[PDB]
Amino acid sequence: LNVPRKTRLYVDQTLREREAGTAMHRTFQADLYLLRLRAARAYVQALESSLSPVSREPLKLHAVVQGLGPTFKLTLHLQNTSTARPILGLVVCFLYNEVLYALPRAFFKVPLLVPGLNYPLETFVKSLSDKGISDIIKVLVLREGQSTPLLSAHINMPMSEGL
Amino acid sequence: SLFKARDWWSTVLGDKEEFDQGCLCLADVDNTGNGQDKIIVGSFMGYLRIFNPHPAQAEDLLLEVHLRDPILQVEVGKFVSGTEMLHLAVLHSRKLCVYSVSGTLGNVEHGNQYQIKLMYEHNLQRTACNMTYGSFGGVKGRDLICIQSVDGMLMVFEQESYAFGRFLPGSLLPGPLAYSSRTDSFITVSSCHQVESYKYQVLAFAVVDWTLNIGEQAIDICIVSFIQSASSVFVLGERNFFCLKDNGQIQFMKKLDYSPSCFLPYCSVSEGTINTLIGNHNNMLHIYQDVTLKWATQLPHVPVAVRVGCLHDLKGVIVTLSDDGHLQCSYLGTDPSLFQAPKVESRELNYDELDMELKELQKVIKNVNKDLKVSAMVSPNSVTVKVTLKNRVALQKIKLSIYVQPPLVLTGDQFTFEFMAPEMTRTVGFSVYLKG
Amino acid sequence: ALTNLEDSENAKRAYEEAVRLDKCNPLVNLNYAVLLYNQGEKRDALAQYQEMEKKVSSSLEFDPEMVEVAQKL
Amino acid sequence: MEPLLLAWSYFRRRRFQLCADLCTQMLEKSPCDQAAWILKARALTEMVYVDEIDVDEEGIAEMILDENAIAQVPRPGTSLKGPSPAVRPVTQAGRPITGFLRPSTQSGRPGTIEQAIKTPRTAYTARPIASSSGPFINLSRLNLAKYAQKPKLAKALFEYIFHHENDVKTALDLAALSTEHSQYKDWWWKVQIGKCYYRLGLYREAEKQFKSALKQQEMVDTFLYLAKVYISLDQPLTALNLFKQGLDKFPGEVTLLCGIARIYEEMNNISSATEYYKEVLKQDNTHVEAIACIGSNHFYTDQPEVALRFYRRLLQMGVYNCQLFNNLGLCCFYAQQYDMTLTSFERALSLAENEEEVADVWYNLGHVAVGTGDTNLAHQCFRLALVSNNQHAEAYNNLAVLEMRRGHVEQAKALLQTASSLAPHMYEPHFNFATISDKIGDLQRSYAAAKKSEAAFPDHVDTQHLIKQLEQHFA
Amino acid sequence: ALWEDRDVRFDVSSQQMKTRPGEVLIDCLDSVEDTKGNNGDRGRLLVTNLRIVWHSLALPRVNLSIGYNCILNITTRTANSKLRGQTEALYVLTKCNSTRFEFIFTNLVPGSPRLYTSLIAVHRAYETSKMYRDFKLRSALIQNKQLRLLPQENVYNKINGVWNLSSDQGNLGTFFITNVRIVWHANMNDSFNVSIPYLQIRSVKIRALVIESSQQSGGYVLGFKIDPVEKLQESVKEINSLHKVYSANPIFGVDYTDAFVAYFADGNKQQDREPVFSEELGLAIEKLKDGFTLQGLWEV
Amino acid sequence: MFREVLPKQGQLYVEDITTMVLCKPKLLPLKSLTLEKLEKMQQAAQDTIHQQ
């Protein structure tokens, strides 16, 4: 068989574990407690800013960028993830730096999202800076009666390769 | 501690001073004869300092004299016409000064003073850049000094006065100068990538004995001669590391992947080989057996002009001197230390406050799983629409856009507002008209 | 594992969970009796011994500790 | 003290701002001084210098629109164009993830311009692909025929034009005039002309100059340059023979052994790349490349303790990254050292200068958590990896696995579809989607997913049983 | 006497954290979490005049006190990108009586990281000013014929012909008296000068101008002798007056448990074995640990 | 002086059930020096552009 081999490192490590197992157990439990703390912290901060592209109220969105050159094709793949329930009133709003990117329609309604179909909703981003400047673009999907985004996404726009 | 340069007597050496190569010298300028060396450091700020370190402490600094003009390339050699006792050479930009550090003792550790006497001086017509010292020709018991110039010229003093001076053929930026005794040749690295060796008597008669086109210009050149079996000449470029023969061709070379700053081929071990140690700009020392790394250490600062010497009964202590003002004698750290979490029974995890915060955050999580007014007014008359927005709380990064339809066209699309104090109104006005 | 990790209260509550959630394995009862007797109680160790003997048979080393925690209690 | 002296000493100590700062003065003071002129030129060209050897970003146009390999379909084992994807993560259909990203990594090549465009910009190079791979001195004002006469000026001027301004045509003009001034007897100008050619596109015209420079004087530089040229013409076995020739010249060079190992890993026969990286170690023992590569290989072939040693070595040598500490965390956890595991991930999260590095650290923390149990912590870590890097397919796949563990089948289906859309070269999202589909039915989707799984990891086992069952249901 | 800028103490009392007379607080920052000790507990950081202090802000007992004459490197690390704001971190490396510690300070709330700058500044001010609170031999004090004064220093008494009862033949030298320190140069090869700070003086008495050091520069007894003793007792009494009026409020010239074991910079190492020669490398190397060899530690 | 007795028999799978697989832990590849220098020179230009 291909049963692995173990070197001096393994027996020294097992001897350390056999002689100092209690301290390892205690410190790993402390580290796990601190990790749960920090993960809950970051999860709550994300819920606050609503920066999760995956978040009752079922949705899933991710934005793909395609193309070099001053004009990029930005396609938002959006999807309703539910057994059988459509989502009527939703709308997408883009947040960009109006001095670097020229978005024609930075806000538009989305079609009735049928559960199970990936809707590609695309736009044409265009770099305006004569010098190569890469700035982030935010996308917020939100209801039409609410003001807090249902979910969000980020895209680091690549360099322009302009003229 | 493994692969660190563990600390020995260490110090900081002034108030934002600046040093360079040649500054750090390490010999018996005191002429005691016991073998223990003494650190000598001179900045081009002016201060010349000499130390006899002991393993911070006050009495370590032998003296801290100050000369008016800057200091370049302090050296220690037989720079006096009469006797065979080591004297200290100080090269100011337009000055040469030989001194003599005479230490008289009192009946207490700190009752002993040190006097530097101006043995002689030399007004320098040209502006000096660096120098070398050695027994030019086949003389013995004397250490002549060949100083360079910033504009190429090299002037030679026969330990007493201005012997002569000849211009280097075809050089613009002066590089590192050295003198090989097994070939009696001044070896330099011209601006045009040529490592050139000139026989001494050839320059004395004014040409090139030989040249070698290395790929770059060198930072330092250190001809080492404690081995009489096979002589070699070390040349440290700014991208490579060559060890050349005595005829002029590469004996071997290393293509360093870092940026060297200083190197010193110190005492060797095997037969024919030569141990050397080089200092990165990445704060490391590397210890090669002529091509092959035998050890590496993390230095505290960027080493400039490292040296290796016996300091207070400990042979082979490494003395480094940064260009900002640090200085440190050190010994390698050879202690592989167990990678293991520290046992600190005193330091416990405070479960109360941490559990409070975790209960708060988990409450938010398990709870979520179950400010501005806008108004538009259209004129009764290309109709002009006016949009007024008013905030309750102070808001930031406001962007207002208008979307009508494809055929209808707006005279204004986007409006950007920055921070606004609470209860502040903002009005925008645009015009919409049919186009198509 | 908690008995050898300087945490006996957690071992107590884990053994309680186990005995509540175990029905047809006397090894749990015998090991909890061993924990109790080593804790200096000797009172509830008899309760765990009686729980085991109510539950009951092949292991060579669970046989001896069965009789050694019996005779020494 | 003096201007020229202080500036030159600033140059020696690699300041590169002060040097120019004093020369600019010294040039305003005197319009006729060439020492400070070329000194400022050196400082400017060395603030930005990067050696041409390890700059091999062909991009996209070179990859398809430029054909230079003689053989079109050469024998498998003589062209550039181990652990299975069930253990080692992958980047393409094959090509398992490597240690020590270098800017010369190609790591597979696209087939068509459309595929190369419609993929992530950084899926074939360490940097996003590109279509093509006041002022101190105006290049259109100086007569290169007069600076060529003065080699002391010509060398620094060429380095300036080539590495600072990136003007290959004027650089080549200067280098040609200089080489004809030296009567073709200095290997440096030949190497520089060869570099000008190599980045103009002319490989054979560059190999000529590199060969003629090797004839003058053997140097590691020219050997590595010829190695690049030969690798560009898709000739590994010529580059290996040339490297062994160079090692015959320089008996223990580390860059040559490392190039041999890089070529052996591009050809994907690790059993010799490990030997050559071990030779590099016997020479250097601080080499980040060889140490990282042998460490990764030791980790993935179920020997995480040796990999932990190899990475603790880099920790001992002052390396302080986000990658190194996450690696130390993975090794410590999988080598069963639970005391130094999570503090390494904390240092990693601290050191991460990106949003993808943070996402990868959170992904690995979720792996730690799911190895500990407590699937909720891993759920949060995967969701945070998504929140940091939206196009993180492994996080989608693992979060869908945990969702289907909970019971939410539609969430898992959507997340696996997203993962398989982001990374088609991976096999786990396809296999899981096919598995869940077959569990509920929809044998058409199960077939369309299991076939893509077999396309991704063609030697899988469960995929074969799935395909057999499906093709049996179809009759 | 003064330890705030000379040691590194853990679990310090609520009184020793209080500003010493000569000390003065400069900047503060709340919610600075402590790391290199994985307690995950917040705190408050203080950059005082002589040392940096950190107290847990919830259990203010557990705390840290790091002196400025015991730090080697201070590094700020700007990372943890777009996911939130650019938060910083402070890495301090310390070496007290040959023991290397490292502390890390993480600014949790990314809304106030300016503190980590000022510290660096004041640390320079701590090192550029050591002639105020330390004892030095044979330094570069004298100008052409006069004394080079510190920023906050003026001379009081200018006495010529003051001997030094620690040498034999290089004695007669001027004696400068200032409000921060007292110096004596040699007036003949004027590099045998001693610059004693009032901070290091323990008691100025007569046995003759005997000056004792405060257990930090050792038991350095300094003896000087002058002309007829009238001016001598005058100088002694005025020196004692200046010493007391300084010790009232020190100057410092700064212009503008198992706790240790969890903060080692090396890792389970508070030690340095005797540095001995090494025949293998040719360098002074730390002693090897009972069976280890150089060529066995080097390979992997 | 009694030692707790441990069962000598482990849990053995008696059938292979198709379970959804997870992606595998990802060792972040290190960088070269040229790559770091190139990225820093690329971002320094951005910083100077924003700082003018």
Author numbering:
A (entry chain D): 425 to 479, 483 to 590
B (entry chain I): 2 to 56, 63 to 213, 234 to 397, 410 to 420, 439 to 493
C (entry chain E): 347 to 402, 408 to 424
D (entry chain F): 1 to 81, 90 to 141, 158 to 499
E (entry chain G): 6 to 212, 219 to 267, 296 to 339
F (entry chain H): 7 to 58
Would you copy out the relevant sentences from the publication that reported this structure?
Patched 1, GPR161, SMO and other ciliary membrane proteins are all ferried out of cilia in a regulated manner by an evolutionarily conserved complex of eight Bardet-Biedl Syndrome (BBS) proteins, the BBSome. Here we determine high-resolution structures of the BBSome alone and bound to ARL6GTP, and we map the BBSome–SMO interaction to model how the membrane-associated BBSome–ARL6GTP complex recognizes its cargoes.
The BBSome–ARL6GTP complex was analyzed by cryo-EM, yielding a density map at an overall resolution of 4.0 Å. Focused refinement of the top and lower lobes of the complex resulted in improved maps of 3.8 Å and 4.2 Å resolution, which facilitated model building. In the BBSome–ARL6 structure, ARL6GTP is nestled in a wedge opening between BBS1βprop and BBS7βprop. A ~ 20° rotation of BBS1βprop from the BBSome alone conformation allows ARL6GTP to move away from the steric clash with BBS2βprop. Besides the movements of BBS1βprop and BBS4TPR1-2, ARL6GTP binding caused only subtle changes in the structure of the BBSome. As previously found in the crystal structure of the BBS1βprop–ARL6GTP complex, the BBS1βprop makes contacts with the Switch 2 region and with helix α3 of ARL6GTP while the Switch 1 region of ARL6 is readily available for interacting with other, yet unidentified, complexes. Interestingly, the ‘backside’ of ARL6GTP (i.e., the surface on the opposite side of the Switch regions) interacts with a loop that connects BBS7βprop and BBS7cc. In addition, the physical interaction between ARL6GTP and the upper lobe removes the upper lobe flexibility previously observed in the BBSome alone preparation, resulting in a more stable BBSome conformation.
